[PDB]
Amino acid sequence: HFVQQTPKSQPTL
């Protein structure tokens, strides 16, 4: 799964 803290940040898996 992905963590995405803002709309324009890249997701971290």
């Epitope: 963590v3 995405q4 803290q5 709309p7 324009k8």
Partner: antibody, heavy 122, light 108 residues
Framework: VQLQQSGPELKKPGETVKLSCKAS????????LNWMKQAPGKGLKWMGW????????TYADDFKGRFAFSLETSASTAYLQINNVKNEDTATYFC????????????????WGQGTTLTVSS | GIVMTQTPASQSASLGESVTITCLAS??????LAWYQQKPGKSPQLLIY???SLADGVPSRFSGSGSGTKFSFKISSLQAEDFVSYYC?????????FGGGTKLEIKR
Amino acid sequence: VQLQQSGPELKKPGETVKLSCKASGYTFTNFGLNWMKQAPGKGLKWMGWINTYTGESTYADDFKGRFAFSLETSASTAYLQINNVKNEDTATYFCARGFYYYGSRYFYFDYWGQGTTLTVSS
Amino acid sequence: GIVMTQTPASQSASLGESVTITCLASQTIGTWLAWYQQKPGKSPQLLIYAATSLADGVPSRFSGSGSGTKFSFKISSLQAEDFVSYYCQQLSSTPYTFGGGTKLEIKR
């Protein structure tokens, strides 16, 4: 869920401050933390933010140089450091949680700290 | 980067009346827009997100409208507690600019 900030700070010109923002009630690394400045009779200014999962900090143009965000993840705490303080730093500082996640439709700041005062004086 | 203009700076009204505050964005901002209240000596508190959505536990009198660049915030019948400051904020691209704020005061 709470954001709890450290107490009032008194600093002489040229000193350093470090102020904390403790989050509780949720997984700390899920959401990022935003820092705002409010000068005495003035409006809110967004200084930048820190990714709580990644450690990557982003600074607004007016806050490059003397300003440094950091994390102590095990104590669920974010910090704001201002180096070489001057008269213009006298203000109240707030942290706020950025509510967003992967697949979210919405973005806003839901929880805010109670704010912390910095006063610069010789 | 992107400027948020909030008129007017000061607004006079009375108990039970309704008021409307504007906020004009410099660029198209979609609906990535929030409204906050700030009482004297306290921190901001979210009232409206996504331009039109009421935050949880916030009273029915508060509402928001708009999308693109033109945005409004309405209170439908004012109580004593309401006469404080309000800020809009753009959440589309960094830096996430706040409006300059409006203070509601009581007419006499």
